[PDB]
Amino acid sequence: AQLRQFYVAAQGISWSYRPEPTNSSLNLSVTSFKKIVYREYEPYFKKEKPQSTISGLLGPTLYAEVGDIIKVHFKNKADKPLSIHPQGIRYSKLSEGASYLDHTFPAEKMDDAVAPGREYTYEWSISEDSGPTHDDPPCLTHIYYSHENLIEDFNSGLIGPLLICKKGTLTEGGTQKTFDKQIVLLFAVFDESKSWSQSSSLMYTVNGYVNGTMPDITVCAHDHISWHLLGMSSGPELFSIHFNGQVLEQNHHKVSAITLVSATSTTANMTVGPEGKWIISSLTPKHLQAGMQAYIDIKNCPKKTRNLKKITREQRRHMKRWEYFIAAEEVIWDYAPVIPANMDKKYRSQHLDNFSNQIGKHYKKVMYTQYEDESFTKHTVNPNMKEDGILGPIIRAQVRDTLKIVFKNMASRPYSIYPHGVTFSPYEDEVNSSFTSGRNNTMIRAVQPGETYTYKWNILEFDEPTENDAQCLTRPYYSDVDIMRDIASGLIGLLLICKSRSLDRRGIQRAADIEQQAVFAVFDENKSWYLEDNINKFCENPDEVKRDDPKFYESNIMSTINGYVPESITTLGFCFDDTVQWHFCSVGTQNEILTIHFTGHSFIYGKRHEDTLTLFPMRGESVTVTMDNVGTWMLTSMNSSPRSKKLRLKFRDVKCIPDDDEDSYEIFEPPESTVMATRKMHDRLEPEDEESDADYDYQNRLAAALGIRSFRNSSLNQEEEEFNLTALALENGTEFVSSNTDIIVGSNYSSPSNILGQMPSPSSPTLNDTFLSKEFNPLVIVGLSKDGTDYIEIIPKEEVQSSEDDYAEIDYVPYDDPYKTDVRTNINSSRDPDNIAAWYLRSNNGNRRNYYIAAEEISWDYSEFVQRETDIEDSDDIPEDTTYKKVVFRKYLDSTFTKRDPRGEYEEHLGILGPIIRAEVDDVIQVRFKNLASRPYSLHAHGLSYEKSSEGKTYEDDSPEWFKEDNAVQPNSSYTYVWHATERSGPESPGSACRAWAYYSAVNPEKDIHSGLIGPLLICQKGILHKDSNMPVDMREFVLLFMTFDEKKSWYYEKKSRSSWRLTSSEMKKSHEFHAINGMIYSLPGLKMYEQEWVRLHLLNIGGSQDIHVVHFHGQTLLENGNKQHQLGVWPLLPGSFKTLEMKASKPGWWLLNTEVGENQRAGMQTPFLIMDRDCRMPMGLSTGIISDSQIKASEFLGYWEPRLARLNNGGSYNAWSVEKLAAEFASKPWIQVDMQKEVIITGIQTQGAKHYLKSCYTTEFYVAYSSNQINWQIFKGNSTRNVMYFNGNSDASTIKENQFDPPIVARYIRISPTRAYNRPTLRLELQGCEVNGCSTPLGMENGKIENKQITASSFKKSWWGDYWEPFRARLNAQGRVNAWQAKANNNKQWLEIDLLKIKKITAIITQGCKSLSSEMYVKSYTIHYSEQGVEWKPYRLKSSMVDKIFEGNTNTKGHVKNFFNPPIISRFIRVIPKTWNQSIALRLELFGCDIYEDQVDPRLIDGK
């Protein structure tokens, strides 16, 4: 246990982004912007503490360890109120640092802002749950900033780092015990226009420097470094950091590039190379336009030589260096190979044709060519596939080997090559500055024309792929002299590094084909230096050209895949039950993010299925796809940007010929070693044999590991250091009910009958609407006019497929014309009978699950629940008050489509989202779709497997005599879709309960993102769902979509007419569209949860572009579960992402939900949510006499049985309320209305019968209604199937029955009405609940908890009659002749004192008294005093003047009176002063309030030193 005390101050300096001096950057007043920055001081603010030289504009680093307390003494020194706010800590209301509407008293409003020249103290406590001990690097990093004004505070500085470490790894000075150096980096963009001073300057900055002017970072050789990477900007930005000639390990993955988004942090581990000076920078072209660079220098520190810097000798049994030959040769390139017949012969297009638009484009390029022997450049080129038009040769290398590359330049300019992450470090010690001068920061030497050179790559043991990776990795390689202009010319290469277990492309499962066709490149001809030569011969004359013409500038950019335009590309074919390994990479960069989606199949990424890929600039990925659906499909750039929508590939999965011999053309793989022409790799030993026929030949100097090698010691021991405090116990992701209301009985249920017994939809007998219809037929109103047509089809007969890796490739001649025969749909009798659901019914699973869905049109208002915040009338939110026509999905009951199913209480935080579709593993789902709109719509699933005639797109090639009924459902029509759940759609083995998918209408992709059609669905394991109703049983689930809506693309029949697009480029229709979560901008209701409870969250984002959303929950830390137990604090969401997370609630109150991206958070996307209390089963009066009889009203009573004089529970002579006549057919029943004058939380209700005159009467069923005003009300429904909740009621007289409201309700008027009863309808009720937006609970726990030593009336204990009326017996319900004391003196100077050990906050007091049957005696008035230590005794007085407020008292022997007081009192000692007494003084009491959470700052190791 330690106390970490820090002294800080925010002060103003003069700064110009240039380091001639380190701190006060001025020279001859060239430029000087005002800035405000944090600074650290010595104790008691005596002298400023000296700063290092690397960090110019960066706050002090804060560090902490689990089990400690942080105290901060912030004070202000600028002309601005400022504050401080951390990110990943468990807050309290006194140490948050942010201001919003949370209904807090004035004493809680000091953290919001401090005045210039004043100071405040911040206290934080760390516990197990906010800990780093979940199988991850020991120390996590976070960022802290100012919350007073997000836009203006950040742009003037005010940024600081925070670190949290595990237990036992920290020293006195803040350093660890193992690592040698810790380095922190910051990347930022500063905009001077939005700042304290108004100017115009935009800077891209590392720390505080611009244009690559940063002091060097010098380290020694072969040392371990720990890196802490941040990144932040006021707008949407992304960073792709790269370290030259180095490799890193992150989250059990070996990487060479680090991707970051604004307001994120990351930790990394690194080992450095032998020597040299290297550059580090980003890869986004916007960053390459500016400097964005930093330098690193490695020196040879003496006597620290670890006997290994980077060296491995040549004693490898299977050496891969051979004689590799490449060349860089000029060529004429034709982009469209369609004008030849089908040659694709990569021959030089010598024809120099010149048209208006180039045909035979003859662009001058330079490309990587390949040869055979050491007599380099003689006419012998190794043949390969006709595809891969412009990519260089593919290179393969394993671990622990050498590669010898011979490069000859023949393109009249210097050129070179270097790979990414392939080598831990090039063997730069061998080379010398005589030739390899390294320029300044390269260490790689270019080669002049007519010269040859040799490079020696060496793969070390530290470059091996980790066990939690794919089969093996892919990396790019290109030129070094000038990255952008060399990339503009067509030279690209790929290198594959494969594992010591992965034999070098011998056999990868059964990989018939390997697709290197996965490179997307954008070529710009305005930057390659070959522009002059082609522009000389392009036009009729070269003297009339200029860059002003858009038709000239835009026409020179070509976006292609593998150098071919997507139009002129043939299809592909694949054998059934075959595996294909793809590897994607993007080199042509357009500072954009790209995503791709497969149709009909799914990926396997790591240990999970994704079915959607997002690729980053200059990054490589590897996936594997299993072929299992016999049909034609298409890879598409789904979720595309508004531009570049023409990116598609076409493939076929054909049923394989059953011939035992010569099913297709195949001799296996005749090369088997990538051998079409030898002598390029003749020393490439046989892939069949690896480095040990019987043993590995080994030569190394194994002394780098100071300790034991310990490769056996895979220290993934799941170590869990534990330390708990307050009420925060250790947690791991499981199914935890934790602390809330719950009972052991009931709970789960089974599903005995599954094959056909599941008919749950028509269960509800009555509903709201009524209009009769039936299912009819598909009813495609339009004729057979090309609704189903061969949109895409090519039939190729090609031999160069070559069956690249393992097994045969189809001949494309002997295929099946339908190739969807199976037995399912290959039926020539009738048409499309829905009996295929009976087929493939998986064993005994059965579980035919039926759903009915309709689509219809409504009107929507974005901002409705803002009324409470709408203090000024103005408009709703805009002069155009946010009302637009939309179309949505809705759920009905039966095939008639006549009655609607009302939305209950669980499903109200949904808004525009449609009904939820739930299923268990391996279940058949039949869904009916009914179109009630005025134009066609369809239904497209996602993730789950399906067969054709169950899709919604209009691309398919398979067009049999069935002109497909689906793909268009015109008005007044219905269809039946059949879907099947399988194993690959389920969750993981050790992961959460289940995951989430989505569906949407997909016939034009601009009706699903917009116009309101969203359909998220859930698939979960066996034994979870309930038989009667498809409901979860274990945990509370929440579903969160959030995405901006643009009301200009929903133009079909919700058309954007609006006075012909009325705007002046300054309206929110165009300028700032509606940022919304579930269709509303603020005040999302229906979010309630208990304290110390587990909640499952499904965060899903689909569609959109260039939108990255960071999610923050105030006061809570969320855990990510599944197979690795990774804990984090903030999650970013990418386009087309689905995530499942778990969360635990910490403390009650009102908290905020937002996204901390920046300027798009102040214009919407905010939501306050509530945590209520641990328990609320406290009676709310109505039996003890607190509630008066004037608040009770009924409509009918028999007479002499009053309705208001009968609400008591356990007494009376004439007891209850009677009606004397039950209704005929329905309830239509008289009601009892109860009012409470306030808003409270209601949880349950008790009931009792009647028994008099040798007769027993009791109600059996009833139903409840509630309201906040007497105008309108609702009917309670939850976990029920008959759309109204029917309670079980009584069974016998004089026996209490208890019921629970599964979601707590909020209201002020309640009314319950019976429906059936035995004998005459009779009732007797009691109510249970608690108070809203406050801590109201038996804090003192006077009735059972406090020991009999702290509540002795030490003030004036002149109380005893003699061992009879001993004090501290003053408890609310003390049976027997026991109560508080009776004063012997009965004077006016004698009072009561109560002591508590810890400071606590008291809110209300209930003073029941006069418990004595012999004689009744109470108190009529009293006053209150309090103190800190016991010498102050500050009287409780009103805000007007110094007057002791008088209080009320009892009025009868059995009476409970509860006194409030608006300002709660925070103290330890309390004193009660009796003033007026009817008779001898007697008392009983109970205290209410709560304890301040983090006051655990008792002295333990002061000053932390």
Coordinates of C-alpha atoms in Angstrom, one line a residue, residues 115-543:
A115 CA -11.3 29.7 -10.6
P116 CA -8.0 31.3 -11.8
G117 CA -5.8 31.4 -8.7
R118 CA -7.6 28.7 -6.7
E119 CA -6.9 25.0 -6.1
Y120 CA -8.6 21.7 -5.5
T121 CA -7.5 18.1 -4.5
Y122 CA -8.4 15.0 -6.6
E123 CA -8.5 11.5 -5.0
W124 CA -8.7 8.2 -6.9
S125 CA -8.7 4.6 -5.6
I126 CA -7.7 1.6 -7.7
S127 CA -9.2 -1.9 -7.2
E128 CA -8.9 -5.4 -8.7
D129 CA -11.6 -4.9 -11.4
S130 CA -9.8 -1.9 -12.9
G131 CA -6.7 -4.0 -13.1
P132 CA -4.1 -5.2 -15.6
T133 CA -3.9 -8.8 -14.5
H134 CA -5.7 -10.5 -17.4
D135 CA -3.1 -12.4 -19.4
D136 CA -1.6 -9.3 -21.0
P137 CA 1.4 -6.9 -20.7
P138 CA 1.9 -5.8 -17.1
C139 CA 1.2 -2.0 -17.6
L140 CA -1.7 -0.4 -19.5
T141 CA -1.7 3.2 -20.6
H142 CA -4.4 5.9 -20.8
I143 CA -4.7 9.6 -21.5
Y144 CA -6.1 12.4 -19.4
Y145 CA -7.2 15.8 -20.6
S146 CA -9.6 18.7 -19.7
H147 CA -13.3 18.3 -19.9
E148 CA -14.4 21.9 -19.6
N149 CA -14.3 22.6 -23.3
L150 CA -13.3 19.7 -25.5
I151 CA -12.7 21.6 -28.7
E152 CA -10.7 24.6 -27.4
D153 CA -8.8 23.0 -24.5
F154 CA -7.1 20.2 -26.6
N155 CA -5.9 22.6 -29.4
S156 CA -3.9 24.6 -26.8
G157 CA -2.2 21.6 -25.3
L158 CA -3.3 19.9 -22.0
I159 CA -2.6 16.3 -22.6
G160 CA -1.1 13.8 -20.2
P161 CA -0.3 10.1 -19.9
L162 CA -1.3 7.6 -17.2
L163 CA 0.0 4.1 -16.5
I164 CA -1.3 1.2 -14.4
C165 CA 0.9 -1.7 -13.6
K166 CA 0.5 -5.2 -12.1
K167 CA 1.4 -6.2 -8.5
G168 CA 5.1 -6.5 -7.8
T169 CA 6.6 -4.9 -10.9
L170 CA 7.6 -1.3 -10.0
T171 CA 10.5 0.6 -8.4
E172 CA 10.8 3.8 -6.4
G173 CA 11.5 6.0 -9.4
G174 CA 8.7 4.6 -11.5
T175 CA 10.8 2.1 -13.5
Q176 CA 10.2 -1.7 -13.8
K177 CA 12.5 -4.5 -12.8
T178 CA 13.1 -6.3 -16.2
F179 CA 12.9 -3.8 -19.1
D180 CA 15.7 -1.4 -19.8
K181 CA 14.1 1.5 -21.5
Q182 CA 10.6 3.0 -21.7
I183 CA 9.7 5.3 -24.5
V184 CA 6.5 7.2 -25.0
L185 CA 5.4 8.8 -28.3
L186 CA 2.6 11.2 -29.3
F187 CA 1.3 12.0 -32.8
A188 CA -1.1 14.9 -33.2
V189 CA -2.6 17.5 -35.5
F190 CA -2.9 21.1 -34.2
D191 CA -5.4 23.6 -35.7
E192 CA -4.7 27.1 -34.7
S193 CA -7.9 28.5 -36.1
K194 CA -10.0 26.8 -33.3
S195 CA -7.9 27.9 -30.2
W196 CA -7.7 30.5 -27.5
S197 CA -6.1 32.9 -30.0
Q198 CA -7.8 33.2 -33.5
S199 CA -5.2 32.7 -36.3
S200 CA -4.6 30.4 -39.3
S201 CA -2.1 27.6 -38.9
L202 CA -2.4 23.8 -39.3
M203 CA 0.5 21.7 -38.1
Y204 CA 1.2 18.0 -38.1
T205 CA 3.3 17.3 -35.0
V206 CA 5.3 14.6 -33.2
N207 CA 5.4 15.8 -29.6
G208 CA 5.9 19.5 -30.3
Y209 CA 8.0 19.7 -33.5
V210 CA 7.3 20.2 -37.2
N211 CA 9.2 19.4 -40.4
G212 CA 11.2 16.5 -38.9
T213 CA 13.2 18.7 -36.6
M214 CA 13.4 16.5 -33.5
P215 CA 16.4 15.6 -31.2
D216 CA 17.8 12.2 -31.9
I217 CA 17.0 9.2 -29.7
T218 CA 20.2 7.2 -28.9
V219 CA 20.2 3.7 -27.6
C220 CA 22.6 0.8 -27.3
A221 CA 22.7 -2.5 -29.3
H222 CA 20.6 -5.6 -28.6
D223 CA 18.4 -4.2 -25.8
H224 CA 14.8 -4.6 -24.8
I225 CA 12.6 -1.6 -25.2
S226 CA 9.0 -0.9 -24.1
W227 CA 7.0 1.5 -26.2
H228 CA 3.8 3.5 -25.3
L229 CA 2.0 4.9 -28.3
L230 CA -0.8 7.5 -28.2
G231 CA -2.7 9.5 -30.8
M232 CA -5.2 12.3 -30.7
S233 CA -6.9 14.9 -32.9
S234 CA -10.0 17.0 -32.8
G235 CA -11.4 15.3 -35.9
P236 CA -11.5 11.9 -37.6
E237 CA -8.0 10.8 -38.3
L238 CA -6.0 7.5 -38.5
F239 CA -2.3 6.6 -38.2
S240 CA -0.2 3.8 -39.6
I241 CA 3.2 3.9 -37.9
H242 CA 6.1 1.8 -39.3
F243 CA 9.5 1.1 -37.9
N244 CA 12.2 0.6 -40.5
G245 CA 14.0 -2.7 -40.4
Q246 CA 12.4 -3.8 -37.1
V247 CA 9.6 -6.2 -35.9
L248 CA 7.3 -5.9 -32.9
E249 CA 5.0 -8.2 -30.9
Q250 CA 1.5 -7.0 -30.0
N251 CA -1.3 -9.0 -28.4
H252 CA 0.4 -12.4 -29.2
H253 CA 0.8 -11.3 -32.9
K254 CA 4.1 -10.6 -34.7
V255 CA 3.5 -7.3 -36.6
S256 CA 5.6 -4.7 -38.4
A257 CA 3.0 -1.9 -38.7
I258 CA 0.9 -0.4 -36.0
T259 CA -2.6 1.0 -36.7
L260 CA -4.1 3.7 -34.5
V261 CA -7.2 5.9 -34.4
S262 CA -7.8 9.2 -32.6
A263 CA -8.0 9.0 -28.8
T264 CA -6.4 5.5 -28.4
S265 CA -3.4 4.1 -26.6
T266 CA -1.2 1.0 -27.0
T267 CA 1.8 -0.7 -25.4
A268 CA 4.4 -2.7 -27.3
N269 CA 7.6 -4.7 -26.8
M270 CA 10.7 -4.4 -29.0
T271 CA 14.2 -5.7 -29.5
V272 CA 16.7 -3.6 -31.4
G273 CA 19.1 -4.5 -34.2
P274 CA 22.9 -4.4 -34.3
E275 CA 23.7 -0.8 -35.3
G276 CA 22.8 2.2 -37.5
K277 CA 20.6 5.2 -37.9
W278 CA 16.9 4.7 -38.9
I279 CA 13.8 6.6 -39.7
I280 CA 10.3 6.1 -38.2
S281 CA 7.2 7.6 -39.8
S282 CA 3.6 6.9 -40.9
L283 CA 2.4 5.5 -44.2
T284 CA -0.8 7.6 -45.0
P285 CA 0.0 9.8 -48.0
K286 CA -1.4 12.8 -46.2
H287 CA 1.3 12.3 -43.6
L288 CA 4.0 11.7 -46.3
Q289 CA 3.1 15.1 -47.8
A290 CA 4.3 16.7 -44.6
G291 CA 7.3 15.7 -42.5
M292 CA 5.9 13.4 -39.8
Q293 CA 9.3 11.7 -39.1
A294 CA 11.6 10.8 -36.2
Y295 CA 15.1 9.5 -35.9
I296 CA 16.6 6.6 -34.0
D297 CA 20.3 5.9 -33.5
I298 CA 21.9 2.7 -32.2
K299 CA 25.5 2.8 -30.8
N300 CA 27.9 0.2 -29.7
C301 CA 27.9 0.6 -25.9
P302 CA 31.0 -0.9 -24.4
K303 CA 31.4 -4.0 -22.2
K304 CA 27.6 -4.6 -22.4
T305 CA 28.0 -6.9 -25.4
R306 CA 25.5 -9.7 -24.9
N307 CA 27.7 -12.0 -27.2
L308 CA 25.0 -11.7 -29.9
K309 CA 23.8 -8.5 -31.6
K310 CA 22.7 -10.0 -35.0
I311 CA 24.7 -12.9 -36.4
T312 CA 23.9 -16.4 -37.6
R313 CA 26.4 -18.5 -39.6
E314 CA 25.6 -20.6 -42.7
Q315 CA 25.2 -24.1 -41.3
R316 CA 21.6 -24.8 -42.4
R317 CA 20.8 -28.2 -43.9
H318 CA 18.3 -26.8 -46.4
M319 CA 19.7 -23.5 -47.4
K320 CA 17.3 -21.3 -49.4
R321 CA 19.8 -18.7 -50.6
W322 CA 20.3 -20.5 -53.9
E323 CA 20.8 -18.1 -56.8
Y324 CA 17.7 -15.8 -57.0
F325 CA 17.7 -13.5 -60.0
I326 CA 15.5 -10.5 -60.7
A327 CA 15.7 -7.4 -62.9
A328 CA 13.9 -4.1 -63.4
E329 CA 13.1 -3.7 -67.1
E330 CA 11.0 -1.2 -69.1
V331 CA 7.9 -2.4 -70.8
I332 CA 4.8 -1.1 -72.7
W333 CA 1.6 -1.9 -70.8
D334 CA -2.0 -2.2 -72.1
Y335 CA -4.6 -1.9 -69.4
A336 CA -7.5 -3.5 -71.3
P337 CA -6.5 -7.0 -72.5
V338 CA -10.0 -7.5 -74.0
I339 CA -9.1 -6.2 -77.5
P340 CA -6.9 -9.3 -78.0
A341 CA -9.0 -12.5 -78.3
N342 CA -8.0 -14.1 -75.0
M343 CA -4.2 -14.1 -75.1
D344 CA -3.1 -12.4 -71.9
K345 CA 0.3 -13.2 -73.2
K346 CA 2.1 -10.3 -71.4
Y347 CA 3.9 -9.5 -74.6
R348 CA 5.0 -6.0 -75.4
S349 CA 2.3 -4.0 -77.1
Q350 CA 4.6 -2.4 -79.7
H351 CA 1.6 -0.8 -81.5
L352 CA 1.7 2.9 -80.5
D353 CA -2.0 3.6 -81.1
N354 CA -3.2 7.0 -80.1
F355 CA -7.0 7.8 -79.8
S356 CA -9.1 10.3 -77.8
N357 CA -9.3 7.6 -75.1
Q358 CA -6.3 5.3 -75.4
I359 CA -6.9 1.9 -77.0
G360 CA -3.7 -0.1 -76.9
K361 CA -2.9 2.4 -74.2
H362 CA 0.8 1.6 -74.4
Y363 CA 1.7 3.2 -71.1
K364 CA 5.4 3.2 -70.4
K365 CA 6.1 1.2 -67.2
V366 CA 9.0 -0.4 -65.4
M367 CA 8.4 -3.9 -64.0
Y368 CA 10.2 -6.7 -62.2
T369 CA 11.2 -9.5 -64.6
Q370 CA 12.7 -12.9 -63.9
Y371 CA 15.4 -15.0 -65.5
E372 CA 17.0 -18.4 -65.1
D373 CA 20.8 -18.7 -64.8
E374 CA 23.9 -16.8 -63.5
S375 CA 24.6 -15.8 -67.1
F376 CA 22.1 -13.1 -66.5
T377 CA 20.0 -11.5 -69.3
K378 CA 20.0 -14.1 -71.9
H379 CA 16.8 -15.2 -73.6
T380 CA 15.4 -17.6 -70.9
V381 CA 12.5 -16.4 -68.8
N382 CA 10.7 -18.7 -66.4
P383 CA 7.0 -19.1 -67.5
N384 CA 4.1 -18.6 -65.1
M385 CA 0.4 -18.0 -65.1
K386 CA -1.1 -15.6 -67.7
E387 CA -2.7 -13.7 -64.8
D388 CA -0.8 -11.5 -62.3
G389 CA -0.1 -9.0 -65.1
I390 CA 2.2 -6.5 -63.3
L391 CA 3.1 -8.1 -60.0
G392 CA 6.6 -9.3 -59.5
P393 CA 7.7 -12.8 -58.8
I394 CA 6.5 -14.5 -55.7
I395 CA 9.2 -15.5 -53.2
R396 CA 8.9 -18.1 -50.5
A397 CA 11.2 -18.4 -47.4
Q398 CA 11.0 -20.4 -44.1
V399 CA 12.6 -19.6 -40.8
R400 CA 16.4 -20.1 -40.1
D401 CA 17.7 -19.7 -43.7
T402 CA 19.4 -17.3 -46.1
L403 CA 18.2 -15.6 -49.3
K404 CA 20.6 -14.5 -52.1
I405 CA 19.1 -12.0 -54.5
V406 CA 20.9 -10.7 -57.6
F407 CA 19.5 -7.5 -59.0
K408 CA 20.5 -5.8 -62.3
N409 CA 19.3 -2.3 -63.2
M410 CA 18.3 -1.7 -66.8
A411 CA 15.9 1.3 -66.5
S412 CA 18.3 4.3 -66.7
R413 CA 17.7 5.3 -63.1
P414 CA 18.8 4.0 -59.7
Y415 CA 16.6 1.4 -58.0
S416 CA 16.6 -0.9 -55.0
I417 CA 14.4 -3.3 -53.0
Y418 CA 13.8 -3.9 -49.4
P419 CA 11.1 -6.0 -47.5
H420 CA 8.9 -5.3 -44.5
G421 CA 9.4 -7.2 -41.3
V422 CA 11.0 -10.1 -43.2
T423 CA 14.4 -9.6 -41.6
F424 CA 14.8 -8.6 -37.9
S425 CA 17.6 -6.4 -39.3
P426 CA 19.6 -6.6 -42.5
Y427 CA 23.2 -7.7 -42.0
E428 CA 24.4 -4.1 -42.2
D429 CA 27.6 -4.8 -40.3
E430 CA 29.0 -6.7 -43.3
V431 CA 28.4 -3.8 -45.6
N432 CA 30.6 -0.6 -45.5
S433 CA 30.1 3.1 -46.1
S434 CA 32.4 2.9 -49.2
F435 CA 29.5 1.7 -51.4
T436 CA 26.7 1.3 -48.9
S437 CA 27.0 4.9 -47.7
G438 CA 23.4 4.7 -46.6
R439 CA 22.8 8.3 -47.8
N440 CA 21.7 9.6 -44.5
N441 CA 19.1 7.2 -43.0
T442 CA 18.8 4.3 -45.4
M443 CA 21.7 1.9 -45.0
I444 CA 20.6 0.3 -48.4
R445 CA 22.6 1.4 -51.5
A446 CA 21.0 2.0 -54.9
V447 CA 22.5 0.6 -58.1
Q448 CA 23.2 2.7 -61.2
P449 CA 22.3 1.6 -64.7
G450 CA 24.4 -1.2 -66.2
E451 CA 25.4 -2.6 -62.8
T452 CA 24.6 -5.7 -60.8
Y453 CA 24.5 -6.2 -57.1
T454 CA 23.8 -8.9 -54.5
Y455 CA 21.6 -8.8 -51.4
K456 CA 21.8 -11.3 -48.5
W457 CA 18.7 -11.7 -46.4
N458 CA 18.8 -13.8 -43.3
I459 CA 15.8 -15.1 -41.4
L460 CA 16.4 -15.2 -37.6
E461 CA 14.7 -17.2 -34.9
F462 CA 13.0 -14.0 -33.6
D463 CA 11.0 -13.7 -36.8
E464 CA 9.1 -16.9 -36.3
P465 CA 5.3 -16.5 -36.5
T466 CA 3.6 -17.0 -33.1
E467 CA 1.3 -19.9 -32.3
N468 CA -1.8 -17.7 -32.4
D469 CA -1.5 -16.9 -36.1
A470 CA -2.5 -18.2 -39.5
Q471 CA -0.6 -20.8 -41.6
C472 CA 2.0 -18.2 -42.6
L473 CA 2.4 -14.5 -43.3
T474 CA 2.7 -12.2 -46.3
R475 CA 4.6 -9.0 -46.7
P476 CA 5.2 -6.5 -49.5
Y477 CA 8.4 -5.2 -51.0
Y478 CA 9.0 -2.2 -53.4
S479 CA 11.7 0.4 -54.1
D480 CA 13.4 2.7 -51.6
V481 CA 14.9 5.7 -53.5
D482 CA 11.5 7.5 -53.6
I483 CA 8.5 5.7 -52.2
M484 CA 5.7 7.6 -53.8
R485 CA 7.1 8.1 -57.3
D486 CA 8.4 4.6 -57.5
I487 CA 5.1 3.2 -56.3
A488 CA 3.4 5.2 -59.0
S489 CA 5.4 3.2 -61.6
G490 CA 4.4 -0.4 -61.7
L491 CA 6.8 -2.3 -59.4
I492 CA 5.3 -4.4 -56.6
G493 CA 6.3 -7.6 -55.0
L494 CA 5.1 -10.0 -52.3
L495 CA 7.2 -12.3 -50.0
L496 CA 5.7 -15.1 -47.9
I497 CA 7.3 -16.1 -44.6
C498 CA 6.2 -19.5 -43.5
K499 CA 6.4 -21.4 -40.2
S500 CA 9.0 -24.0 -39.2
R501 CA 6.1 -26.6 -39.2
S502 CA 4.6 -25.3 -42.4
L503 CA 6.5 -27.1 -45.2
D504 CA 7.2 -24.6 -48.0
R505 CA 4.1 -25.0 -50.2
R506 CA 4.2 -28.8 -50.1
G507 CA 0.7 -29.3 -48.8
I508 CA -1.7 -26.9 -47.1
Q509 CA -4.7 -29.0 -46.2
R510 CA -6.0 -29.7 -49.8
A511 CA -5.3 -26.4 -51.5
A512 CA -6.2 -26.8 -55.1
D513 CA -5.5 -23.1 -55.9
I514 CA -3.6 -20.2 -54.3
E515 CA -5.0 -16.8 -55.2
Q516 CA -2.3 -14.1 -55.4
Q517 CA -5.0 -12.0 -57.3
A518 CA -5.9 -10.1 -54.1
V519 CA -3.9 -6.8 -54.6
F520 CA -5.9 -3.6 -55.1
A521 CA -3.8 -0.8 -56.7
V522 CA -4.6 2.7 -57.7
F523 CA -2.1 4.1 -60.3
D524 CA -1.8 7.8 -60.9
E525 CA 0.0 8.9 -64.1
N526 CA 0.4 12.6 -62.9
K527 CA 3.3 11.7 -60.6
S528 CA 5.4 9.1 -62.6
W529 CA 8.3 10.8 -64.4
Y530 CA 7.3 8.9 -67.6
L531 CA 4.5 11.5 -68.2
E532 CA 6.6 13.5 -70.7
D533 CA 7.5 10.7 -73.0
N534 CA 3.9 9.5 -73.4
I535 CA 2.4 13.0 -73.5
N536 CA 4.8 13.9 -76.4
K537 CA 3.2 11.3 -78.6
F538 CA -0.3 11.2 -77.1
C539 CA -2.0 14.3 -78.6
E540 CA -1.7 15.6 -82.1
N541 CA 0.5 18.4 -80.7
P542 CA 2.3 18.5 -77.3
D543 CA 2.1 22.3 -77.1

